[PDB]
């Protein structure tokens, strides 16, 4: 019965700093869960972005990512933002945020095509 | 689960696992004790007593080896016929509840042998610090 | 070596002289008994059972159970309580009205007149149209003529409101047991021979006091705690007249009291669940109240406080004793609280004797007043129920308190009148072995050692 | 008495003894402490009474030299105007009563001298951490 | 005006788990005093087995009693028990729980003859 | 001004003054936090709300690599993109609000890296006690 | 034929304000610190026992 | 400012049931006259000035 629903930009100028956020209802932000961040190239397969956790865990991502990947979560809103620094035209991806459970990643959010153009 | 591999999660989530895997998450059960016109009252009798039982608790960890260290080892020895396991197999194979049920014998013992190793070490020290 | 550093040690056993609240205690069983027929059990925390009286050596602390503090303390605690355990009941406020009275039927002389007056008056009902007419017994100390016909009234009925106490809450002495919080500690002096002020070279500390039971009494206080072996006096300076001088003797003297007259009560509906309880019929012989005491025994307490009395005041010295010498009511008389009823039982029959340098029972009469005030506030005062049956009470005499009259112009006699004064001379009776300290630790002290870094 | 040879017994035991003999039992003296429909007023305020002590004494030590050592050796040197005694006299001869009366004066610049020598030693310990 | 009772077994079997308790009326446990165990085989001295203290003392016993000897303090019901692990026919003796004070055990228990029997 | 030279006054008095100035007198900032028939209602609830804060920052330390040491240097880098302005400059350009106005965007991440450097110290310390 | 009402005769009454309602708003119990609520969130459950969940 | 009431009053305490006093107005002694306030005329004058400018 949860729902994940992101917001934010799709499309959005190179070398610039990318902020998506995506807003958590059905359940609580501070469960047994890492809400994250999981990428697709279009055409191409998945690529997991990072997550964050409801608990005290620090966030870990992918290390492709080049440490230019923040992951905020906003308890007070119900809330988990991602972050990308200096952006290029090729990480154009659809992005999605979703939640690790007991189960692997059940209730994701619809994923929006995010097309870093020039 | 969602917490293997990097194994953390919230609080009371190591319970259920083996004392070896929750003896590196620690922080946050020690974390989540302190914080959180007649029912002020209960609140307020509520706020001192949690106050009062953290207050014991540092007392008890401060008048021991350590002040907040929150893992201690110390000078007092073991003896073998509380434990009386293997001791490699407790850590992957007992749980903390299971643990307090195996030792509620052999308890309040140990806070003195740790009380007399800690003056000990204290008037060793006077001592040390005496002569030199 | 004559490079002293310091040192801090904390949890240093040295303590201060301080006046902080104290902590209630009360027994578990008094707590077995439901819904608080005495006061205050949920308002007192219950008492471990056998606490640390842990004993001190080589220790010498000096008492004052004059300027002591927690005697204060425990007056404002019992005044507070008192207060505390009326408001749920009953207001009298409808009460005050014409009374019709006259004598009860009783075969009454002309020269003793009728203590017990019958009286019969208007009272509302729980409904509000209807009134009833309701007759009563009231005591002489309680009806005043309002002004043929012969009509009283109340006697508070122009100065304050009066409360009727619930039968439920009773006025018996439950043991209380002071204790100090974290931080505070309690010197008890154990000297056998202590009067009062002064070093008491063998102390002992302990976290609660005794069972203290708290007695309402002006004189010949009631079942508290007698001395070891003596019977000493306490004063704050026996050379001072205007100082009380508590004695308290060894051997408790047992005093019997009773009222005879059998009572029935009598439940009349004020309003709409208002109960007020009056006196119904006198089942059986109308007699007096009185209270008893074995003379032999009396006699010989009595040779013992003269045999005491003559250390602070030479040896030829002539001592007798006087009755009250006026005032109000409950300092003339000797006052208490037998089976929840008040008694003012005079004390002429005790205090008749002279005393030179070289079977039988005392009856006292006392008198039964229904509403009181004590403590002497300005706009209180409670009524007391009236209880069923023939009433009756033992209990163990422990101390009077005397007072000395003014003697000057070159007398050798010197006179002692039982005079009760302040409630607070009773727990200065109590208290004289506690005090409350308060714990320093940290003490610093130079010594040999210096920190390296 | 009864705690002879083995020398303890409960808390202020100590209190008649000297003070080199008192030095041995600290840790129960600070331990009963913090331990131990109007009226719950006079009991929090009780409470929260003792705990404001405890706490005023735990953050007076940790402004110190030491955290929760409970002897602890310093830097700061001993004016012997202050004692005036003989040094080893004063732990078999007096009282920490009679102590405590002969400092009376001398107290509150003691305080001040442990503070000024233990921020001196952080500035010194932090230009050491700071140069290596 | 201190009253000490001992209770429990009379008969045991060598080589078992021995243990006694004591109540006390008349006083407090947790005062300055040493509540004690000793022992007297028959027709013979008497042997001090050990004692704790109702203040916060560690237990000294005698180390003739081979550490087999726990003496356990009950606050809570103004008691303290005796134990000896792996008895001995040997170990017959009248028992006694005392109370060293500022005097030398003043109260005593009665004293109960263990007769450790096969 | 008055203090010139012996540079110290009364708490909040290194306020105005740069942070290097300032470091050198935090004793005092840490002493006047804790110490100082319904209204006996709101002067608890405000004395328990003093020492709630209280002992939440002392446990915030404690649970980091200083109990009371009140300077403590750690074993956690610095990220120059939070700071990027020139060392030595702050400490003789910026005033406390004006650094806590800086860096309050970059907080919060620093405790979960103090709370790592802490347990991964005390595993290391462990490891390297037991093997001894 | 004259009436009363019923509880005059046994306490007094008091009129319920027609401010305050009856109605039920939620209340959630919480437990203060160092205490936690365990839930057991078994599906199958008839209130004693062991809760595997 | 000087405020005055210049009627002078008697107080008279009635008793309105046990305990229950009330404070009523007995007699006037005196002149019956208004109660009234003064200022200072240049002083306020000035004041004013003060606030216009
Ligand atoms: C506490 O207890 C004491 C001890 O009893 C009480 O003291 C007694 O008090 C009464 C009065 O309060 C004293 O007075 C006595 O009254 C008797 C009755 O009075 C009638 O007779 C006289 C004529 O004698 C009439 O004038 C009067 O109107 C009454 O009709 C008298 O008989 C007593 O006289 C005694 O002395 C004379 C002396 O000549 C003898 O001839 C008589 O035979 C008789 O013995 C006396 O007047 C009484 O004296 C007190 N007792 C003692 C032993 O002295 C206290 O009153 C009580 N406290 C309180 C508050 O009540
Ligand atoms: C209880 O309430 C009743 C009801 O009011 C009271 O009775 C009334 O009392 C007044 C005052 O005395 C009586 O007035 C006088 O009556 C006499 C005798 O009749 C008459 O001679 C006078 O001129 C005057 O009228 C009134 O009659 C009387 N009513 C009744 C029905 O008795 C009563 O006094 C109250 N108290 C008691 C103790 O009963
Ligand atoms: C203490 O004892 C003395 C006696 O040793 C008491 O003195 C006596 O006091 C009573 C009244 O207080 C006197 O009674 C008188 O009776 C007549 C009879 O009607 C009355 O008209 C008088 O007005 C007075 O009440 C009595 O005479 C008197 N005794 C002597 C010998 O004079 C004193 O009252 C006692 N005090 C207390 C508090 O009991
Ligand atoms: C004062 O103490 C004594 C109690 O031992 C009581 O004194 C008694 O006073 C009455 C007064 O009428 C004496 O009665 C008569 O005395 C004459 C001598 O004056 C005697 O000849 C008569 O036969 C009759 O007994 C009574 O004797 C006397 N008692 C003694 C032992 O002499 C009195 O009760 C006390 N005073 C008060 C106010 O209580
Ligand atoms: C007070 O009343 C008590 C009632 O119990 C009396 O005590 C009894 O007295 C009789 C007579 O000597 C004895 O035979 C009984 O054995 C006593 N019983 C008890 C329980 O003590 C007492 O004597 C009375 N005292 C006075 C002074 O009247
Ligand atoms: C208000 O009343 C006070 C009463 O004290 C007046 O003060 C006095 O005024 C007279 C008249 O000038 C002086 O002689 C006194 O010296 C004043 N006494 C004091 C204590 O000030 C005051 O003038 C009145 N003010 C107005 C505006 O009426
Ligand atoms: C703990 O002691 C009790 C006796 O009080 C005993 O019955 C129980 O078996 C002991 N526990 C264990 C694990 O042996
Ligand atoms: C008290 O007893 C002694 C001894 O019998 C006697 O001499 C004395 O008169 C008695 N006192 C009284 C007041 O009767
Ligand atoms: C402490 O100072 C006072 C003066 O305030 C002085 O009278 C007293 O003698 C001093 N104490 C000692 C032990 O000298
Ligand atoms: C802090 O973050 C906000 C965005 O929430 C940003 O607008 C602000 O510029 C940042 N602060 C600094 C000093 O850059
Ligand atoms: C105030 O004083 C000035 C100067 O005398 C005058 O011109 C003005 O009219 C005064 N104001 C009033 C309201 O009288």
């Known amino acids: 019965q949860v729902q994940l629903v992101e917001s934010g930009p799709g499309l959005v100028r190179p070398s610039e700093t990318l902020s998506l956020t995506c807003a958590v209802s059905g359940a609580s932000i501070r469960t047994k869960a890492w809400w994250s961040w999981i990428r697709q190239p279009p055409g191409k397969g998945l690529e997991w972005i990072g997550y964050?956790?409801?608990?005290?865990?620090?966030?870990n991502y992918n290390p492709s990512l080049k440490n230019r990947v923040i992951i905020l979560k906003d308890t007070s809103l119900n809330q988990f933002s991602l972050r990308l620094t200096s952006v290029t035209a090729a990480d154009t991806a659809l992005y999605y945020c979703?939640?690790?459970?007991?189960?692997?990643?059940?209730?994701w959010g619809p994923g929006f095509l995010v097309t870093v153009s020039s | 689960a969602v917490g293997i591999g990097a194994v953390f999660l919230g609080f009371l989530g190591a319970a259920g696992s083996t004392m070896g895997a929750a003896s590196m998450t620690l922080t946050v059960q020690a974390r989540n004790l302190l914080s959180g016109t007649v029912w002020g009252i209960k609140q307020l009798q509520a706020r001192v007593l949690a106050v009062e039982r953290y207050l014991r608790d540092q007392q008890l960890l401060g008048i021991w080896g350590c002040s907040g260290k929150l893992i201690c080892c110390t000078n007092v020895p073991w003896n073998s016929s509380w434990s009386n396991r293997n001791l490699s197999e407790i850590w992957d194979n007992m749980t903390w509840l299971q643990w307090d049920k195996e030792i509620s014998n052999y308890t309040q013992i140990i806070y003195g042998l740790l009380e007399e190793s800690q003056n000990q070490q204290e008037k060793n020290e006077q001592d040390l610090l005496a002569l030199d | 070596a004559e490079n002293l550093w310091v040192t801090v040690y904390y949890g240093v056993p040295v303590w201060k002289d301080a006046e902080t609240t104290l902590f209630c205690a009360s027994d578990a069983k008094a707590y077995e008994t439901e819904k608080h027929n005495v006061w205050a059990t949920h308002a007192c925390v219950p008492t471990d059972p056998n606490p640390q009286e842990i004993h001190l050596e080589n220790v010498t602390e000096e008492f004052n159970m004059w300027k002591n503090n927690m005697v204060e303390q425990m007056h404002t605690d019992i005044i507070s309580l008192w207060d505390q355990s009326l408001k749920p009941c009953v207001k009298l406020t409808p009460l005050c009205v014409t009374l019709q009275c006259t004598n009860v039927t009783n075969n009454i002389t002309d020269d003793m007149r009728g203590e017990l007056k019958n009286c019969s008056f208007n009272m509302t009902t729980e409904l509000r149209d209807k009134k009833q007419k309701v007759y009563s017994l009231f005591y002489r100390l309680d009806v005043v003529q309002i002004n043929s016909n012969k009509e009283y009234r109340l006697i508070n009925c122009n100065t304050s409101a009066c409360t009727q106490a619930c039968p439920k809450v009773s006025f018996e002495p439950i043991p209380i047991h002071y204790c100090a919080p974290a931080g505070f500690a309690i010197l008890k002096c154990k000297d056998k021979k202590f009067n009062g002020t002064g070093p008491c070279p063998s102390v002992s500390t302990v976290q609660c006091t005794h069972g203290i039971k708290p007695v309402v009494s002006t004189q010949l206080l009631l079942n508290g705690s007698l001395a070891e072996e003596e019977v000493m006096i306490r004063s704050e300076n026996i050379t001072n007249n205007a100082k009380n001088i508590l004695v308290q003797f060894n051997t408790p003297v047992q005093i019997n009291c009773t009222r005879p007259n059998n009572n029935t009560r009598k439940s009349i509906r004020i309003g709409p669940g208002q109960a007020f309880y009056a006196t119904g019929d006198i089942i059986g012989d109308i007699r007096q109240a009185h209270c008893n005491v074995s003379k032999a025994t009396w006699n010989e307490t009595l040779g013992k406080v003269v045999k005491q009395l003559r250390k602070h005041f030479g040896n030829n010295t002539i001592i007798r004793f006087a009755n009250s010498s006026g005032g109000d009511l409950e300092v003339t008389t000797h006052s208490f609280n037998c089976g929840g009823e008040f008694f003012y039982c005079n004390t002429s029959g005790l205090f008749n004797s002279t005393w030179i340098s070289n079977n039988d029972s005392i009856t006292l009469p006392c008198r039964i007043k229904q509403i009181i005030n004590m403590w002497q506030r300005i706009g209180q005062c409670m009524y007391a129920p009236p209880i069923q049956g023939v009433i009756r009470c033992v209990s163990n005499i422990t101390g009077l308190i005397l007072t000395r009259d003014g003697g000057s112009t070159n007398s050798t006699t010197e006179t002692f009148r039982p005079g009760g004064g302040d409630m607070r001379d009773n727990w200065r009776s109590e208290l004289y072995k506690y005090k409350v300290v308060k714990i320093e630790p940290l003490g610093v002290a130079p010594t040999r050692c210096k920190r390296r870094v | 008495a009864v705690g002879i040879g083995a020398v303890f017994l409960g808390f202020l035991g100590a209190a008649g003894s000297t003070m080199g003999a008192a030095s041995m039992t600290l840790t129960v003296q600070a331990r009963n402490l913090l331990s131990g429909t109007v009226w719950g007023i006079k009991q929090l305020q009780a409470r929260v009474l003792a705990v404001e002590r405890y706490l005023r004494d735990q953050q007076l030590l940790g402004i110190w030299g030491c955290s929760g050592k409970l002897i602890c050796c310093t830097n700061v040197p001993w004016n012997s105007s202050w004692s005036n005694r003989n040094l080893s006299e004063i732990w078999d001869n007096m009282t920490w009563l009679q102590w405590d009366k002969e400092i009376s004066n001398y107290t509150q610049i003691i305080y001040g001298l442990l503070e000024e020598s233990q921020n001196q030693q952080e500035k010194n310990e932090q230009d050491l951490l700071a140069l290596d | 005006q201190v009253q000490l009772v001992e209770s429990g077994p009379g008969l045991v079997r060598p080589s078992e788990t021995l243990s006694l308790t004591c109540a006390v009326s008349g006083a407090s446990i947790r005062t300055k005093a040493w509540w004690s165990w000793i022992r007297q085989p028959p027709g013979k001295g008497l042997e001090w087995?050990?004692?704790?203290?109702?203040?916060?003392?560690?237990?000294?016993?005698?180390p003739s009693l081979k550490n087999r000897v726990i003496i356990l303090k009950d606050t809570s019901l103004n008691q303290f028990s005796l134990r000896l692990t792996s008895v001995t026919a040997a170990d017959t003796a009248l028992?006694?729980?005392?109370?060293?004070?500022?005097?030398?055990?003043?109260?005593?228990?009665?004293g109960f003859l263990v007769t450790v029997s096969s | 001004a008055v203090g010139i030279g012996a540079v110290f006054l009364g708490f909040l008095g290194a306020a105005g003054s740069t942070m290097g100035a300032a470091s050198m007198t935090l004793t005092v900032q840490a002493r006047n936090l804790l110490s100082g028939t319904v209204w006996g209602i709101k002067q608890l609830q405000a004395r328990v709300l003093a020492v709630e804060r209280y002992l939440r920052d002392q446990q915030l330390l404690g649970i980091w690599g200083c109990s009371g040491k009140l300077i403590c240097c750690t074993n956690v880098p610095w990220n120059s993109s939070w700071s990027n302005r020139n060392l030595s400059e702050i400490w003789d350009n910026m005033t406390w609000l004006q650094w806590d106005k800086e860096i309050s965007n970059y907080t919060q991440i620093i405790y979960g890296l103090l709370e790592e450097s802490q347990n991964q110290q005390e595993k290391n310390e462990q490891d390297l006690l037991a093997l001894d | 034929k004259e009436y009363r009402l019923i509880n005059c005769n046994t306490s007094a009454c008091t009129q319920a304000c027609p401010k305050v309602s009856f109605e039920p708003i939620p209340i959630h119990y919480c437990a203060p610190a160092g205490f936690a609520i365990l839930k057991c969130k078994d599906k199958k459950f008839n209130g004693t026992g062991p809760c595997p969940s | 400012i000087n405020c005055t009431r210049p009627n002078n009053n008697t107080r008279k305490s009635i008793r309105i049931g046990p305990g229950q006093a009330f404070y009523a107005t007995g007699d006037i002694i005196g002149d019956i006259r208004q109660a009234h306030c003064n200022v200072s005329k240049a002083t306020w004058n000035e004041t004013l000035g003060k606030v216009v400018k």
């Open positions: 964050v956790s409801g608990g005290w865990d620090l966030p």
């Open positions: 979703a939640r690790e459970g007991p189960e692997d990643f059940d209730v």
